XYZ file of N, CA, C and O in Angstrom:
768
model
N -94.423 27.954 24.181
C -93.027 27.596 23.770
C -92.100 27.453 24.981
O -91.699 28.398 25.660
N -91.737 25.861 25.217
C -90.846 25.809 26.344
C -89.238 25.356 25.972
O -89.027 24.213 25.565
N -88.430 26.063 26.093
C -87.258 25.671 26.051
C -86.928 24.550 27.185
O -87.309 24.541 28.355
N -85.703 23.140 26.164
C -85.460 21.931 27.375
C -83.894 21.979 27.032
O -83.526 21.628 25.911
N -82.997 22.399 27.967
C -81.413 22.610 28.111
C -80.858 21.108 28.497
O -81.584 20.709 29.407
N -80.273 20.518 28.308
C -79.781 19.496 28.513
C -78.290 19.729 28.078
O -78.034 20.454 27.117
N -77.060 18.936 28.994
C -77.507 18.168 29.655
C -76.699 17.952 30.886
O -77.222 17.995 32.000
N -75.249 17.686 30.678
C -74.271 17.615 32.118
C -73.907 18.976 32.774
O -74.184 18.755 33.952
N -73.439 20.282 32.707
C -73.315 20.758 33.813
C -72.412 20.691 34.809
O -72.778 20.912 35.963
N -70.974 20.345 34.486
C -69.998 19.439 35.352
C -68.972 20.473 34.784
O -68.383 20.106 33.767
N -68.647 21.784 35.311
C -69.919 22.494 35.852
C -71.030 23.358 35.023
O -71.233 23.144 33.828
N -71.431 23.929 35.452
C -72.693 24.898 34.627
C -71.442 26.225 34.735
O -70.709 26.455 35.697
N -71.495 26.852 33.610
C -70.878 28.402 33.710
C -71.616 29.558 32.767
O -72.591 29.156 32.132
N -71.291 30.781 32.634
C -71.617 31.793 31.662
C -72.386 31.449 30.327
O -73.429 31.792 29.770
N -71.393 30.646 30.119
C -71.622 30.202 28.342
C -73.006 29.466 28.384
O -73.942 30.073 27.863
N -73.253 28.259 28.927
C -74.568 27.620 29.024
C -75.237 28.553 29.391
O -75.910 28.725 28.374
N -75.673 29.537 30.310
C -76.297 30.665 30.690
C -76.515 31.358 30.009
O -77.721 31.598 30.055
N -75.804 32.164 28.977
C -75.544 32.988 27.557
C -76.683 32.175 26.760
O -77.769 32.617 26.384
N -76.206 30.975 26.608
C -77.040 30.012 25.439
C -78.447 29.886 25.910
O -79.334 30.364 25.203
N -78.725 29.333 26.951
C -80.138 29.671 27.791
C -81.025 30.687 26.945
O -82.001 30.557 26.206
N -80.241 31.766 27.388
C -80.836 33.443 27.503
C -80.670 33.835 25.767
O -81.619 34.423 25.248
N -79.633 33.542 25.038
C -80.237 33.811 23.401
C -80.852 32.761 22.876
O -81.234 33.039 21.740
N -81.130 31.633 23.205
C -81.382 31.139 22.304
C -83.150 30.836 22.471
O -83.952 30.350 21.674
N -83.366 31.516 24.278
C -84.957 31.796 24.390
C -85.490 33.317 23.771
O -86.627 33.621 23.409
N -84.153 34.212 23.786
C -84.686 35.436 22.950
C -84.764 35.189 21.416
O -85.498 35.989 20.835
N -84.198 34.308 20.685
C -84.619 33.764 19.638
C -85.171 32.626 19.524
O -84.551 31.618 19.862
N -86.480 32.553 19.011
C -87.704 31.416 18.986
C -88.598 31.739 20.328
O -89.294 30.802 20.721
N -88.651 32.970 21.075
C -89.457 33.225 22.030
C -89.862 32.241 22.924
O -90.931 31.631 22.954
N -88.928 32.156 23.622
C -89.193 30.790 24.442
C -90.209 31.172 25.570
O -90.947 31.903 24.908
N -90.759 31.167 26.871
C -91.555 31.407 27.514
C -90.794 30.894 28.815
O -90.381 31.781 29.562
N -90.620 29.913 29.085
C -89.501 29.447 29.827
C -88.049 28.326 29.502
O -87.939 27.704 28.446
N -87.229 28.269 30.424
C -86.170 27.358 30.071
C -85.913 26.524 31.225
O -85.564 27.037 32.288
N -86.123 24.744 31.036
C -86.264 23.854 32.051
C -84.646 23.564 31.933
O -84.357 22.950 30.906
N -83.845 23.800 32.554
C -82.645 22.768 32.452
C -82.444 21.435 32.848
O -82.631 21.278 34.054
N -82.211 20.702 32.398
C -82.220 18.745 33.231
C -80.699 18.792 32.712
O -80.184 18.689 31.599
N -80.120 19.032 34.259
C -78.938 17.661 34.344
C -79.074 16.421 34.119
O -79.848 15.697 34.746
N -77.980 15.883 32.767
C -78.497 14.743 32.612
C -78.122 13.304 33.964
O -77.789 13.425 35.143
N -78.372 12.013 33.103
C -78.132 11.052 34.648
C -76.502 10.201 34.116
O -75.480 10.637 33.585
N -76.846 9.102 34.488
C -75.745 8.312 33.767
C -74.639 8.665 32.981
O -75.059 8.878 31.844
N -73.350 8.840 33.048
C -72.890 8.798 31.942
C -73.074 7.401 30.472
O -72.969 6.282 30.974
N -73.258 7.357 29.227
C -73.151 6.434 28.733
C -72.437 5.398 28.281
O -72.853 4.358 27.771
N -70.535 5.989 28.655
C -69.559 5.243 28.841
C -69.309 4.869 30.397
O -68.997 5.835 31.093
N -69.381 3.853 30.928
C -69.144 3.838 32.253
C -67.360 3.350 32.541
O -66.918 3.271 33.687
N -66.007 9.165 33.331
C -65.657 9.502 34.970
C -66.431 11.021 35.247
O -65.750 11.937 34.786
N -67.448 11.387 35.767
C -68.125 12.987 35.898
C -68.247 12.720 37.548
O -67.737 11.835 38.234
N -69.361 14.135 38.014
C -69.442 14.435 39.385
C -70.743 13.737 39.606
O -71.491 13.359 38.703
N -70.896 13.634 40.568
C -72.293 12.844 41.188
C -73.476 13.657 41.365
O -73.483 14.621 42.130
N -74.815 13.176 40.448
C -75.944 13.615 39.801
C -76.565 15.263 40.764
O -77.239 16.170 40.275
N -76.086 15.169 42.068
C -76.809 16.144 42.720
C -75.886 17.279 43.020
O -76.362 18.396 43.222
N -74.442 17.046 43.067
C -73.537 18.320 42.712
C -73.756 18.781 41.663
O -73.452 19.974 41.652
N -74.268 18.320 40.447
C -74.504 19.075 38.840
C -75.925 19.751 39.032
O -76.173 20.945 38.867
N -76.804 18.763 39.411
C -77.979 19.282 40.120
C -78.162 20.701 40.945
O -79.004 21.587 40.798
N -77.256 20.607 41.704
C -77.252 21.595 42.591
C -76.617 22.873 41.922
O -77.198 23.957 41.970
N -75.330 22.695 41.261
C -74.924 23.734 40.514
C -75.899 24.583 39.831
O -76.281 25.725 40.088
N -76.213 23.765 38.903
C -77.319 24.100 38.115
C -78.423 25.043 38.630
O -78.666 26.041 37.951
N -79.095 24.831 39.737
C -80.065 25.149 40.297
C -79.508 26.812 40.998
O -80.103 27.889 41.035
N -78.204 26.432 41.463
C -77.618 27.839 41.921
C -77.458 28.733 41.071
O -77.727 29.907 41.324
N -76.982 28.324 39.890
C -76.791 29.633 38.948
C -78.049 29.643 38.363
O -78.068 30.602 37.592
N -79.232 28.987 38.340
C -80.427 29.691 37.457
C -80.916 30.328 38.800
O -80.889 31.558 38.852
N -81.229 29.839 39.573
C -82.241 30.368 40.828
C -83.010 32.061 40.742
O -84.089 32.580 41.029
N -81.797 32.430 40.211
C -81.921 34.151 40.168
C -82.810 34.932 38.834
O -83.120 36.097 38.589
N -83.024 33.566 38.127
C -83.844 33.861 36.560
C -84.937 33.791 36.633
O -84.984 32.562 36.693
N -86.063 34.125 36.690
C -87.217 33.790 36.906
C -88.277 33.105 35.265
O -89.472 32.942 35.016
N -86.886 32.883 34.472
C -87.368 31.842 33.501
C -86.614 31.036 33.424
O -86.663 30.516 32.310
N -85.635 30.474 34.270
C -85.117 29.333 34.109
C -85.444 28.577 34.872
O -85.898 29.251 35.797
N -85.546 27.235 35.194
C -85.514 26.419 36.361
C -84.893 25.232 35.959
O -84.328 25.132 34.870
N -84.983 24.110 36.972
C -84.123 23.194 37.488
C -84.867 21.462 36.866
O -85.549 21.124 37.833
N -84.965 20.707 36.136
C -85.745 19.324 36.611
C -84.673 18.494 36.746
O -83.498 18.661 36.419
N -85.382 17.325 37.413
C -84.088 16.135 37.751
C -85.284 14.850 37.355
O -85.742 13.919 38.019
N -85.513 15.330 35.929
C -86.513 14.258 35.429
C -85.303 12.984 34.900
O -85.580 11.811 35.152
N -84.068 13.298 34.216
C -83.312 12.677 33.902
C -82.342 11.899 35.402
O -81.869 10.764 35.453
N -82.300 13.023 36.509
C -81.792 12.474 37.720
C -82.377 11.223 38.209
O -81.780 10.171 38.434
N -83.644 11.483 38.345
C -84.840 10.590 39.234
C -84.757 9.223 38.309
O -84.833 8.154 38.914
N -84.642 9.207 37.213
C -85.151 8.343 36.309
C -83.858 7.087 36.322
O -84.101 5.987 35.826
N -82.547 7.378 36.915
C -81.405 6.295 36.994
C -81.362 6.110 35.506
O -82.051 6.599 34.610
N -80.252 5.178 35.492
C -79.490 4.855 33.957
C -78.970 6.219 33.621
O -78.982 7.364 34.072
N -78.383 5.349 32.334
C -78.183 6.904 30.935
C -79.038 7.582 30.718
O -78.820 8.791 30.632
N -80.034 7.186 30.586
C -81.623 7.908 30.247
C -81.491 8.281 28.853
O -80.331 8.441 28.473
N -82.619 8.494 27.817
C -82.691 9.032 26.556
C -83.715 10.499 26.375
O -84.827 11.010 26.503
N -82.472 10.630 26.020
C -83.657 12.242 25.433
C -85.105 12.165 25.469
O -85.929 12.652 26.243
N -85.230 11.317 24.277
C -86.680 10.839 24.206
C -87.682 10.546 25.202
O -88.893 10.676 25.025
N -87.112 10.141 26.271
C -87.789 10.196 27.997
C -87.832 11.284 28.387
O -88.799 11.577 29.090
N -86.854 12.273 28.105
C -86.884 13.553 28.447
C -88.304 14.641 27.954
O -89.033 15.452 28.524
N -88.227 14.362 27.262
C -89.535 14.912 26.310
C -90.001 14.018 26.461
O -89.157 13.416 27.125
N -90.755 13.419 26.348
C -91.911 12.344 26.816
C -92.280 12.878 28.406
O -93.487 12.821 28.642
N -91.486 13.354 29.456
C -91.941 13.559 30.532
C -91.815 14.768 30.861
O -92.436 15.037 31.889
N -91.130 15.814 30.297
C -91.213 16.861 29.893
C -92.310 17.434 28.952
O -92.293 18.664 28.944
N -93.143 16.942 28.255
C -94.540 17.091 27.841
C -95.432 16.720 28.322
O -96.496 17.308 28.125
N -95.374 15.608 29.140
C -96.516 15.381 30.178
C -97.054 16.361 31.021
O -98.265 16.503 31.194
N -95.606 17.491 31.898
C -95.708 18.305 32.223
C -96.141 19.769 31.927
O -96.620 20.639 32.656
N -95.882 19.750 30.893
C -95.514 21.130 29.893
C -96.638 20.321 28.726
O -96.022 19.659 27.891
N -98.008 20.300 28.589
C -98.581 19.698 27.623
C -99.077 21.035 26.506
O -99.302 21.039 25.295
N -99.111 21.970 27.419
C -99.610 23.430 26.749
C -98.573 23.886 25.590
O -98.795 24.454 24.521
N -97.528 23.500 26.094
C -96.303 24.040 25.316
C -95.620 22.915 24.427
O -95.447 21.701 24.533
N -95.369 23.725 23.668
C -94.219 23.003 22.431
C -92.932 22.979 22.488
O -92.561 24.144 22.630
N -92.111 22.323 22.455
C -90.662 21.880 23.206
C -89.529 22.215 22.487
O -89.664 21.821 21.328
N -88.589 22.707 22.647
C -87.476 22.963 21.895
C -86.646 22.437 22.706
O -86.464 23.081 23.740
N -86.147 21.596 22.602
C -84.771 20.374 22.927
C -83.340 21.239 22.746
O -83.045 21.401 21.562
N -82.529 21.742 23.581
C -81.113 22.566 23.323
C -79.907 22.001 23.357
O -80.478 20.924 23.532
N -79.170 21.807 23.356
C -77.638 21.203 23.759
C -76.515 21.433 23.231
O -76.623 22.114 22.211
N -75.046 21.033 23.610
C -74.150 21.519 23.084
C -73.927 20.655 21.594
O -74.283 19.477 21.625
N -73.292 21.241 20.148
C -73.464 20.471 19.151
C -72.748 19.142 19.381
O -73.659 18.338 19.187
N -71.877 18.577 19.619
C -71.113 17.579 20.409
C -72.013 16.336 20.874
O -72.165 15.207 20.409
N -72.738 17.248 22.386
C -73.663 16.392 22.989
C -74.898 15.991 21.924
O -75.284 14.823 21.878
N -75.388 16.840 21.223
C -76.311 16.945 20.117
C -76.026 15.855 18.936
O -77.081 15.561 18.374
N -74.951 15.212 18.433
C -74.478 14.694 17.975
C -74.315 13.101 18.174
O -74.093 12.266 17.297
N -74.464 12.925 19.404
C -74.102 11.613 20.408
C -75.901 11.585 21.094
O -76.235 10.813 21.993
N -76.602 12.323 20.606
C -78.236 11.598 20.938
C -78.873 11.067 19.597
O -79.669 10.129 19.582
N -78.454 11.751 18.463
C -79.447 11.390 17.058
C -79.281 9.942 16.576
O -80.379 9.438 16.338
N -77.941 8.883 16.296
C -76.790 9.291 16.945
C -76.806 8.470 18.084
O -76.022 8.750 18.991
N -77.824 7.165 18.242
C -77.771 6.380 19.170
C -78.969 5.795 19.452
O -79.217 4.698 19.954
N -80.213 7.320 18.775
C -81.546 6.976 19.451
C -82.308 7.104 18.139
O -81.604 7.167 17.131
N -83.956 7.166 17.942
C -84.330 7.141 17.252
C -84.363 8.253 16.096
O -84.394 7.840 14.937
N -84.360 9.164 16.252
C -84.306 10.766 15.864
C -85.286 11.035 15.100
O -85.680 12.188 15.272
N -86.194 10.109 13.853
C -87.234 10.365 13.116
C -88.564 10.436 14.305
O -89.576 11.108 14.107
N -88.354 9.700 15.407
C -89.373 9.903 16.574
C -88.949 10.988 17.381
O -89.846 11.754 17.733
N -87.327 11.336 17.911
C -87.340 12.510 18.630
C -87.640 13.689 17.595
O -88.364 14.510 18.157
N -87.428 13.961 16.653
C -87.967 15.402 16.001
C -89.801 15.574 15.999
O -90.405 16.629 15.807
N -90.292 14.489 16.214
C -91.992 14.725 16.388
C -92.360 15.221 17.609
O -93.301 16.010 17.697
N -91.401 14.663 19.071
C -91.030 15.397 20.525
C -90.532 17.112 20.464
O -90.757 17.776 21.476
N -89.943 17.710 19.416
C -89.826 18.935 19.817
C -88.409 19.377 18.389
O -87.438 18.709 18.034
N -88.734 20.272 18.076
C -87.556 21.271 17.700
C -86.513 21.440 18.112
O -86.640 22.388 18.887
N -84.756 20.897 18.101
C -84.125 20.625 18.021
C -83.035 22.325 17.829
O -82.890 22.845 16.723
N -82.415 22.913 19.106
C -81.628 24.098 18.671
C -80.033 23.821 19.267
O -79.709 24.125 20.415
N -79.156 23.226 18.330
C -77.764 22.997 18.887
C -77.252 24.365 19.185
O -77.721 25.310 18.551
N -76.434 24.541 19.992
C -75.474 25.900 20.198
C -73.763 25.049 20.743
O -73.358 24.140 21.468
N -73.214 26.177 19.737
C -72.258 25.589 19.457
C -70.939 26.980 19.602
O -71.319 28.140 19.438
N -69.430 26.685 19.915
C -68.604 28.072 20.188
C -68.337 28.585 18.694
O -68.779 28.071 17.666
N -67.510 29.719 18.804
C -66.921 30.388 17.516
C -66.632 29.782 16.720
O -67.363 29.894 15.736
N -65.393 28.737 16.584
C -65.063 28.195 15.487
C -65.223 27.020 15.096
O -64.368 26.309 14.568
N -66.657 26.671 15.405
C -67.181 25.488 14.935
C -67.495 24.930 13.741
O -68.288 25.571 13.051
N -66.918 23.489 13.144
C -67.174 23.475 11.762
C -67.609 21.949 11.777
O -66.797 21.100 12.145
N -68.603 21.678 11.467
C -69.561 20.158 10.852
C -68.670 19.491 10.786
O -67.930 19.970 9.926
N -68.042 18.169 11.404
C -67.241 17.128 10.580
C -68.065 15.958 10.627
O -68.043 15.312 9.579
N -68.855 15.456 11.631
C -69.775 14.247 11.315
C -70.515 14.324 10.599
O -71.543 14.940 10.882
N -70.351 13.734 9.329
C -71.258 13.214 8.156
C -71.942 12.571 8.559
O -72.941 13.163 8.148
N -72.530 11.315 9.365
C -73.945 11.212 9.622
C -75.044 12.593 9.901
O -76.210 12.542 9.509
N -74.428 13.910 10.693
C -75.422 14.785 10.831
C -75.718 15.780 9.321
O -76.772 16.360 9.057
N -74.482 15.757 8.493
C -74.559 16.309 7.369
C -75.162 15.378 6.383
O -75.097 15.998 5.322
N -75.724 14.206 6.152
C -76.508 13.286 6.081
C -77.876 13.529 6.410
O -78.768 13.665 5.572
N -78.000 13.574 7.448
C -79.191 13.927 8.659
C -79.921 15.054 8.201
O -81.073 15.202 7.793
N -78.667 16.032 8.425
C -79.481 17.532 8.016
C -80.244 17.454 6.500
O -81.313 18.063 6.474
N -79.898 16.878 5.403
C -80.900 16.927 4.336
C -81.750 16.361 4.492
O -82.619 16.703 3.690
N -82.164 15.341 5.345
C -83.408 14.735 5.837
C -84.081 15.964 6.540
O -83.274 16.886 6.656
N -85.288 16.240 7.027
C -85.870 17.105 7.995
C -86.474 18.426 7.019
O -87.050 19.374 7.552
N -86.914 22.289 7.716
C -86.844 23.711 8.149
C -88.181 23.604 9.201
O -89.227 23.057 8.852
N -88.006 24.125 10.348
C -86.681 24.375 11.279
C -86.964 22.936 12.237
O -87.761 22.748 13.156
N -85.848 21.931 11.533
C -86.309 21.065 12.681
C -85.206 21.251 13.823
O -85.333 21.439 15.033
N -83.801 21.101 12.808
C -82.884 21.265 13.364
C -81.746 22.542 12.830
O -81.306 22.694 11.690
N -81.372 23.612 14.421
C -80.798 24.538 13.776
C -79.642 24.572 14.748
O -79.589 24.157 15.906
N -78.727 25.166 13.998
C -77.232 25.363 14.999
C -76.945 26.872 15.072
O -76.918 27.702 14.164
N -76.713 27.023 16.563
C -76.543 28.803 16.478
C -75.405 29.180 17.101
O -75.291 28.897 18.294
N -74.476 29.802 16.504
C -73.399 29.966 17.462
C -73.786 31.416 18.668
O -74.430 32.465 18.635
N -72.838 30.564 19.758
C -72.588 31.412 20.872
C -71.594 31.976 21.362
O -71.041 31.163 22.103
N -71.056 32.943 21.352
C -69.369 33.559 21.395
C -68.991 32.765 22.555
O -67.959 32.100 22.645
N -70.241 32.926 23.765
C -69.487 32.639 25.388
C -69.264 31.031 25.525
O -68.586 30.700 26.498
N -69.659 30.171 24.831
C -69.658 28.853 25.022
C -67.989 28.462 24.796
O -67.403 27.403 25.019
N -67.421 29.921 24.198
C -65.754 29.448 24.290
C -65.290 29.502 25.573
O -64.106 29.760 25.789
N -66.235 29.248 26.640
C -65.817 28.933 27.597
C -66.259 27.663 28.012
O -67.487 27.586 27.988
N -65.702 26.670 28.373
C -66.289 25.430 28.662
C -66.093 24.269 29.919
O -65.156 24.280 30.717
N -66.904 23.544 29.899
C -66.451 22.855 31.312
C -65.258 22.329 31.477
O -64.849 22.199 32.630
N -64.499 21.943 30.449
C -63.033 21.082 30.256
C -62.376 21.907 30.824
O -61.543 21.453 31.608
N -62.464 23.403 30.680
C -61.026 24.658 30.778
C -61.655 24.616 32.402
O -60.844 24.373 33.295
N -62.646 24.779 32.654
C -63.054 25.073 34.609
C -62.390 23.624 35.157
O -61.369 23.516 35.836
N -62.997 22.867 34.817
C -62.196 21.432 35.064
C -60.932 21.475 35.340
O -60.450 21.027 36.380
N -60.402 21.928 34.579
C -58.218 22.312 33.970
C -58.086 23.041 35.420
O -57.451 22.618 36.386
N -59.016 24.515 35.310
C -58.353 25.618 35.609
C -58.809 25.400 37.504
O -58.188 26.160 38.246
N -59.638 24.602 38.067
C -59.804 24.398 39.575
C -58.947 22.887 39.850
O -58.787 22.626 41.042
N -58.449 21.990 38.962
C -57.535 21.135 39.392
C -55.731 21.673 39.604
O -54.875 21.224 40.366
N -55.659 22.744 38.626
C -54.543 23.609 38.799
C -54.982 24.397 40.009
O -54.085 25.216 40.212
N -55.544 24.482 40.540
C -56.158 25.948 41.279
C -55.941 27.029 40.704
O -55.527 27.853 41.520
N -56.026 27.467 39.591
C -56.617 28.363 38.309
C -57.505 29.278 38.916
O -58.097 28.470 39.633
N -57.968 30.221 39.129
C -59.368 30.932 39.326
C -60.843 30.880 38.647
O -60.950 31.132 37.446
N -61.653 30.644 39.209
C -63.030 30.412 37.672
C -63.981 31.230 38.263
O -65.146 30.843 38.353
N -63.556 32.534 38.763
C -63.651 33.849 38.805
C -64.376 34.130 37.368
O -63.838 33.903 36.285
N -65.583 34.622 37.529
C -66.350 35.944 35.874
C -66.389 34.736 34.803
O -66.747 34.950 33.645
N -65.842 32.928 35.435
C -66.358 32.020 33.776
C -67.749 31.652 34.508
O -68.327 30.729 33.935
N -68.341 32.097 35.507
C -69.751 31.075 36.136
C -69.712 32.336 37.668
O -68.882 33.049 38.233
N -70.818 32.074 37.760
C -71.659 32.241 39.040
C -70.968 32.231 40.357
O -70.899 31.100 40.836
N -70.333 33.363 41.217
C -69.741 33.181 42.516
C -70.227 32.431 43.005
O -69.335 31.802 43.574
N -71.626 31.761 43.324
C -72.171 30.418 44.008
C -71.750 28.943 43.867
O -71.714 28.019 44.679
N -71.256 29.096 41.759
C -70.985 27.826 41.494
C -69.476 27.719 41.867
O -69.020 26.808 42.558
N -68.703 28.801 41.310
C -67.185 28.478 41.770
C -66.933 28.487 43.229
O -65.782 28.118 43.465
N -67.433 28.704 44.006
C -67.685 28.592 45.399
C -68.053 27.029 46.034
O -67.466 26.338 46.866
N -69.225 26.824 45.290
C -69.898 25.260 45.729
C -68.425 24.469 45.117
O -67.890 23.543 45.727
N -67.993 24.934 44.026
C -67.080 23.710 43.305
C -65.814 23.591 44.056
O -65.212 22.519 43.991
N -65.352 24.530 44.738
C -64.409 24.902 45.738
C -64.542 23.966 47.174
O -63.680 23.211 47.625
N -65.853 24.246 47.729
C -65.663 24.097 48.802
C -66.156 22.249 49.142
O -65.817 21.672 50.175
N -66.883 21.674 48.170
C -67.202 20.474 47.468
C -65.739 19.518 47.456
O -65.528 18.381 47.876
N -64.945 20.412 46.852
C -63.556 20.079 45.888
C -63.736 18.787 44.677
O -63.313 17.632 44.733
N -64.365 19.333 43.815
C -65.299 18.688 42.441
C -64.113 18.132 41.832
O -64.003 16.926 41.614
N -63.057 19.143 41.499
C -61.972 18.910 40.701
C -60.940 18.664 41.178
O -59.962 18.455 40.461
């Protein structure tokens, strides 16, 4: 059982980290690959190897998380579905659980095939406190498909990249929301 985290990271903080770490203690994950994704699909974010790099700084210290830049390497928007497709090439032993924020989760089904990505892997959205369903295509969706697709809330994800974004263009502190390495790299970078 391999957990696949996707996807931007602009920046990585607590909350994605939090989500990582419960959502491999529930469904026993074995490890957790994170892929920064590539492309944005509207053609404004940070450039593929500052997210990259973030990323890589705050897992480094996990010895079940790690880093791919299968979505980096690959140019374009890239599709999930490539993701897993080359993410099982690798990982053939293991069975895939696909993660993301419900949002981002929403904007892959949702664009791409989804009756072919649910045969690629198990599907676990994580989503903040007061999250409530409004896209009816996924409430649609969801009666199609146990357990293909599940949504789990995460208290810490009420922290998010928009407010670090806000709070280092104000020069805000992002102090205890992420990793002294990442608010450091994002600092000295000047991301925001």
């Amino acid at each position: 059982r391999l957990g696949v985290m996707g996807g931007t990271f602009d920046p990585i903080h607590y909350g994605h980290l939090v989500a990582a770490s419960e959502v491999a203690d529930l469904f026993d994950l074995d490890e957790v690959v994170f892929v920064p994704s590539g492309q944005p699909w509207q053609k404004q974010v940070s450039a593929a190897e500052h997210r990259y790099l973030m990323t890589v700084i705050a897992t480094a210290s996990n010895p079940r998380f790690s880093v791919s830049r299968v979505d980096i390497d690959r140019g374009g928007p890239t599709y999930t579905k490539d993701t897993l497709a080359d993410l099982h090439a690798l990982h053939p032993d293991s069975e895939l659980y696909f993660t993301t924020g419900a949002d981002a989760l929403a904007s892959i089904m949702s664009w791409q095939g989804w009756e072919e990505l649910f045969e690629l892997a198990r599907f676990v959205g994580v989503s903040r406190p007061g999250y409530e369903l409004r896209n009816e295509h996924i409430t649609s969706l969801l009666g199609q498909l146990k357990d293909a697709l599940t949504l789990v809330e995460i208290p810490a994800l009420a922290i998010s990249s928009t407010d670090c974004r806000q709070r280092a263009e104000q020069s805000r502190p992002l102090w205890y929301l992420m990793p002294d390495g990442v608010v450091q790299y994002v600092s000295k970078c000047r991301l925001y």
